[PDB]
A paper describes a structure:
More than 70 factors participate in the dynamic assembly and disassembly of the small subunit processome (90S) inside nucleolus, leading to the early maturation of small subunit. The 5’ domain of the 18S rRNA is the last to be incorporated into the stable 90S prior to the cleavage of pre-rRNA at the A1 site. The Kre33 module, a subcomplex comprised of Kre33, Enp2, Bfr2 and Lcp5 in yeast, has been shown to act as the last element to place the 5’ domain of 18S11. When bound in 90S, the Kre33 module is observed to hold in place several elements of the pre-rRNA and the 5’ ETS in the assembly phase of 90S.
We thus determined a cryoEM structure of 90S isolated from yeast strain where Pih1 is depleted (Δpih1−90S) at resolution 3.99–7.24 Å. Following placement of the protein and RNA models into the Δpih1-90S density, it became immediately clear that in Δpih1-90S, the region where C-terminal tail of Krr1 is in state B2 contains a much larger density that cannot be assigned to Krr1. As described immediately below, this density is identified and modeled as the complex of Bfr2 and Lcp5 N-terminal domain. The final model of the Bfr2-Lcp5 complex contains Bfr2 residues 168–453 and Lcp5 residues 1–141, both with density correlation coefficient of 0.6. The major interaction between Bfr2 and Lcp5 arises from an analogous long-short-long helix fold, or the UTP3/SAS19 domain, in both proteins (α1-αS-α2 where “S” denotes “short”) interdigitating each other with a pseudo-2-fold symmetry. This interaction resembles that found in the complex of exosome-associated exoribonuclease, Rrp6, and its binding factor, Rrp4730. Bfr2 and Lcp5 each contributes slightly more than 100 residues to formation of their interface that buries a large solvent accessible area (4843 Å2). The additional helices of Bfr2 (α5-α8) and Lcp5 (α3-α4), on one side, buttress against the central interdigitated Bfr2-Lcp5 helical bundle and on another, against helix 11 (h11) of 18 S RNA. The Bfr2-Lcp5 complex establishes a number of electrostatic interactions with h11 via mostly arginine and lysine residues. Like state A1, the central domain of Δpih1-90S is open with helical regions of 18S (h20, h22-h24) pointing up and stabilized by the associated proteins S13 and Rrp5.
Author numbering:
A (entry chain NH): 97 to 274, 282 to 317, 326 to 445, 453 to 983, 1010 to 1116, 1128 to 1237
B (entry chain NI): 3 to 27, 32 to 105, 120 to 189
Write the structure that this text describes.
Amino acid sequence: LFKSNIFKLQIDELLEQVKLKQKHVLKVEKFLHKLYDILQEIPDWEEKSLAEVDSFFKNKIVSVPFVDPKPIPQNTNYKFNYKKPDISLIGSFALKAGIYQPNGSSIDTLLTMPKELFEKKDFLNFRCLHKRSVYLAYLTHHLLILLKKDKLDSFLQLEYSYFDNDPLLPILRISCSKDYNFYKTRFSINLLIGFPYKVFEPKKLLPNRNCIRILPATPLYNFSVLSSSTHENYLKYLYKTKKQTESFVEATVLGRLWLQQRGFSSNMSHSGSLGGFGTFEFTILMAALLNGGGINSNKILLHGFSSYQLFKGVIKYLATMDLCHDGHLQFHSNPASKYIDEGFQTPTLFDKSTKVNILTKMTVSSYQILKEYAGETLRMLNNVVQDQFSNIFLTNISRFDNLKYDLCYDVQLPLGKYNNLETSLAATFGSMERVKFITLENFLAHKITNVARYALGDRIKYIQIEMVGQKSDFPITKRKVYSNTGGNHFNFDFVRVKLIVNPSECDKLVTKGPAHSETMSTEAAVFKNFWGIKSSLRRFKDGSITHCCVWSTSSSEPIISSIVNFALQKHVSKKAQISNETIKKFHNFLPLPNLPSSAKTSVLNLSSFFNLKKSFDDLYKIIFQMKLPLSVKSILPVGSAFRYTSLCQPVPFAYSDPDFFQDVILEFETSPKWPDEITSLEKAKTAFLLKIQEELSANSSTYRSFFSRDESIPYNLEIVTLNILTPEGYGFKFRVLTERDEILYLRAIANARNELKPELEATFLKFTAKYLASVRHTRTLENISHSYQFYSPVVRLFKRWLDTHLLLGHITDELAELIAIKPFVDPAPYFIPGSLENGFLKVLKFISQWNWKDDPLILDLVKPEERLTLAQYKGIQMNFTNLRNSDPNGTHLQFFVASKNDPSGILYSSGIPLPIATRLTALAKVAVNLLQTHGLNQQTINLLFTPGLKDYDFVVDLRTPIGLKSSCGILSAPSNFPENLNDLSEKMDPTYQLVKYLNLKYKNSLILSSRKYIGVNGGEKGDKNVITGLIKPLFKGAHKFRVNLDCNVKPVDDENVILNKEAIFHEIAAFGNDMVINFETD
Amino acid sequence: IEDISAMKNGFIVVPFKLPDHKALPASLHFMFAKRHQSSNSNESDCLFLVNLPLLSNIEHMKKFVGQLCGKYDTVSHVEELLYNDEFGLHEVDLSALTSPRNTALLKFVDAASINNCWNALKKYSNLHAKHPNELFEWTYTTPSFTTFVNFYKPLDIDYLKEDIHTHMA
């Protein structure tokens, strides 16, 4: 099988990044044997009560981190004595769970509180937690003396730590810092004092039965009590499943790779953090799948599945799982294993005879994000078109938090002391409510998630929260792990909620909300209270009643922050301000069109582009209705009006914008009677074209027309193009393209000499550079623009960043426009386009991944469920390999612009300089690193938008009087077409045309590099032309003596001279005298 | 620099003194002129130019050898002048493809009429530093926006319709 063979080759290269060492295993085994010998020296202490435990280790240097509240004799209804410690060779080393990944790992030890200290009568109302902590505090004195025989204190240290961000669960910190040292293993340890086996019955550990009976469903207290009681039974069942299944090690390796790709581990997930689905979850999910017993009690998998077969099976079963809102599972010790389809809308898999809810550590809110990622993972596993087998498994979701998350709302939680928790937080919990939500990260986050579900509703695809400031190191000298986190005695500094929002259902800002009727709906009546004061029940469009939620959408700020400010201060509490400052800092820095309601409408609204497209469609329908003596075929637009994804939208009545003209290609009928010459065919085909150009100003006087030759094409300036001007002054380019260029390159190319043999096909290459399949490309771009509305703002942010960096002027524009749709059409192996900054960061990461010197780029145009097959992509891969073999440095074609309609790869990637592309790729990687290092603010937004613009041959600093900022639409009122074509051309800034003419004349020696978006780079001024100097090595020194080579060889040396710097400066003196600021010799 | 105004390829260089503005670094526009003898009419007892400076004008190429005109009052005739390109895009014409080297306009009809023009410029090649005051300051015109205005303006319909009607037969 190809799937069972190519997957092993794709995983073995990355297997060295998580490989193990035999010397590290031997050092870990020696450290574990020394730790087991140290733990065997802890004997049973005397019979002690709570007061006698306070007589032993109250004011001790080594005291246990007791679970909340503080250790007092108020609830001392039982005793508390240190018992005999029990240790075994179990934990992460029992199944080799430790993996030496790039981020490392840790280990686990078989440690628990004995039955002499923990009792089933003290399990109710959390009385056994104080008894086990006092026993651990009494045994900590023996741990610092009798069990401190590791003999590695020079390289290792002993400390107390909290497990899973909870003070009740401890973690033993005995590892070598950066005899019993684990420096070769480079891993940590974790051990606590939990309840014994079958200490709590399943009736007492039921979902309705809380261990801390203060009772509601304990999401953390009952889950940890069931986990501590049946950890060894679950580990023995997992070891028996790993012994029965030969490919269980490969399934656990694929499960760890998928958990690393998802950025999730076996930590807490229902406590407002990322975790749950990790090594502990995959050890039970793959065991239950291999043992069978699904929702229909059928065999989900077996031990006979292959390594790639079980990896594809686990990827398919991840999206097809039923644990949170679609079912539950129930496994015995090893008597049976069966599941059900009872969706409880909460993650819970209550085991049959093991007596543990497996999914209780996770949450349905985290499962909603998990099911969304697993659906794309199962779709990518089913897809066999892209060769991202190693890419998808190694792409961590949490590696790029800015790219993978569209928006994040973070606030500072000043929790204060124990008597100051009611100031910033208003999560009023009663008796049973504080039993289930004792933590401030549990009570306030559940109130925030309930407020978000009631107000936004369908406007959030998933819920993810984080509580920064939780102390992990348990203070042995103090009571527990409590630090000054945001001015709080408790460990809770800041709260951040990741806005995982589906953009289709979150596009409502001020519209109908909760529907009301004659019957008083509880959601509709309390919609005003749920949305702050916003969603009062009003009328609807169809005569019904619906709430009117109030949210503000801005082109310079985020709409999530306005929705949060409207639906939290008047709904929960006004003491918190969760917003994204970088979203407002980047959207304000992003350019916007000069049209009405520009700040009122967001980036998803394209009414200005739709109005410009409707005016172009009405002009095209009038042209199609008009008939002349010469028959035509079609008139298709491929310009900015047909694109609607540029740096700026269609501004109202732009006079002299850089993208003011919308290109429309018009094709005539079959006219092969014209001659093969370009001038002869143009004169033969203009019998009715001159009459059509004259009559277009009369029959279509609302628009305009012209007849001018275009000099943009190489060696072709004998055409007649209509410079159509709208009644408001909007530009359009009705260009008529003939078939004489392809006929001359095919049939009339024999007349070309040796100086024109390679240029014989250049006439057809210039004609097909923007007219080969641009009509089909513009037709297919309407579905992409309708699907990915945020891709237009991402392309706008990418074009504005390229204009500010000034590194997009040495290439074409078709390749730059088609490269921004990769992160939206092909989101794998990352997130889809949800934000403009996230889309631009993913585009820079994709450009950095597609290294032009290493791997030529290749892509296929796939419609949103068109796509090319692997055999169809084999020709593009062969053309990219042939281009890489011909140009390893990529001097003529660095990155291959390969598409379905461009299988050659050099359709729009010809003439790009290798050092300019290498400098642009290095600057983009530096700016992505600088934006991540500068936090999330305007400095990080300007980290990718402030080039140095210095240390070049010519410094980019000019002063010109031809200011055309208002005519270009870039602000610091025209509403009609200009009087003359020369006056309209003089209204624009000619400094960019003079810089381009100087760069074209001196492209061999002194290239005046600039940006493609002249209007975006100009901005407020729009007059000075930035010309970065790129100097060849023959601009100041000496070259070979060749006066017949048409070079600038003159007397500086005898004959061995180069293009002289003083001669080049005097040559460019008159060209730059109108904008004379700063330029000199090389 | 200015005194070194001769080439070993048979070219006497006329170093044109130019006004060093803020687009330059008294600038020495280094341009050479080699006495060519071939089938071209510009080589008929004249010197083919080399290393032609950019930003040409009506008499900017004559001002490159203007030390001969500024001292000897050069008066002559003209036969031909070629190998001059504004941007190098004239090598492959549109109609030509579908169906000396870097020389400016520094040439004459012969050598007897150019004894005050070409022979004086050869004398001014050695006297580029001796007669720099006789050499004219090459302060050519600034690049105005009218050239870019006329380039981007629409063309006349009747200018192409008359050629289309003439070539229709």
